[PDB]
Design an enzyme around this catalytic site. Sequence first.
Site, PDB file in Angstrom:
ATOM      1  N   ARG A  15       4.869   0.526   1.298  1.00  0.00           N
ATOM      2  CA  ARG A  15       6.248   0.028   1.527  1.00  0.00           C
ATOM      3  C   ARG A  15       6.356  -0.706   2.868  1.00  0.00           C
ATOM      4  NH1 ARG A  15       7.545   4.470   4.983  1.00  0.00           N
ATOM      5  NH2 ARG A  15       6.336   6.206   4.118  1.00  0.00           N
ATOM      6  N   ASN A  16       5.403  -0.430   3.797  1.00  0.00           N
ATOM      7  CA  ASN A  16       5.368  -1.058   5.103  1.00  0.00           C
ATOM      8  C   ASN A  16       4.424  -2.238   5.186  1.00  0.00           C
ATOM      9  OD1 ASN A  16       7.474   0.267   6.568  1.00  0.00           O
ATOM     10  ND2 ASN A  16       6.101   1.981   7.064  1.00  0.00           N
ATOM     11  N   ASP A  27       3.080   5.366  10.486  1.00  0.00           N
ATOM     12  CA  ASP A  27       3.752   5.314   9.175  1.00  0.00           C
ATOM     13  C   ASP A  27       3.078   4.298   8.247  1.00  0.00           C
ATOM     14  OD1 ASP A  27       5.504   5.796   6.987  1.00  0.00           O
ATOM     15  OD2 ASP A  27       7.212   4.784   7.919  1.00  0.00           O
TER      16      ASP A  27
END
Length: 277
Positions: free
Chosen positions: A156-157, A152
Amino acid sequence: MHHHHHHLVPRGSVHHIKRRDIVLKWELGEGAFGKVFLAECHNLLPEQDKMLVAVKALKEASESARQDFQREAELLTMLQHQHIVRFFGVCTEGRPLLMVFEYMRHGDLNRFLRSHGPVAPGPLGLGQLLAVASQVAAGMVYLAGLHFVHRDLATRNCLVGQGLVVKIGDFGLPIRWMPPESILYRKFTTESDVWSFGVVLWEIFTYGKQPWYQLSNTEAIDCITQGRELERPRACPPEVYAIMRGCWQREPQQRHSIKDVHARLQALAQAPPVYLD
Ligand SMILES: CC(C)(CO)n1cc(C(=O)c2cncc(NC(=O)Cc3ccc(Cl)cn3)c2)c2cnc(N)nc21
């Protein structure tokens, strides 16, 4: 949950932190089976009496969640790199169970890009965008070396700390960042991570715009499966779009290696091209 990481074997035990050494301040966020708090942590590092940390408070005790907690904790203690989220340990005395991480003063990279686009305030220049991209690529080189598949990768991570240091984390499908084989066959490899890295490059160069923003979730899935490529961002030099296209080869074996992508970004970050939109 962490079955795909079975080949990764912990060398040692997780660091244990006393509950009384954690002093919660306020919530930083919430979502992935728990809230994240800013907190003060005492007796963690020798030189500093107290320091700021980010604390994740686990929502359950299934107890399949407690099994996942221990395994995740053993996995995170293994990840030690300049551009990977720094895990400090766990607090297992009482409920909820706590996971302690480094506090990254500027928060998530997606919000950082969105607020510094269309710390020193203003729009990020080409050199700064290349520096962000090179750091994320450095973290991905490290993960590929460990045979750790992220699954992922997205801005945003990622987190931004003091002096614009960027670190990769996972705050808990991200279809818009996935290649066709991951969408269709759930095949997650170093090669699907490189494709997501190419999408991360696109996010960086669009100041955090969502990939395929002009399409619904259904239109985006069909579009990726059919082989349509994300358009070149206005702020993206031709050299950088060539990297994105290299990450986006349909055949996983044809995609550029993360070592080469990182090396190319280092070259561009050290001497940015004279590019003006
Ligand atoms: C932006 C928010 C508020 C979002 O919650 N936020 C979270 C911070 C964390 O440090 C954090 C929180 N929860 C879970 C984890 N877990 C991992 O990242 C697991 C992992 C997987 C793969 C790899 Cl390769 C590495 N690590 C991390 C953080 C810190 N500071 C600030 N300001 N906000 C944070």
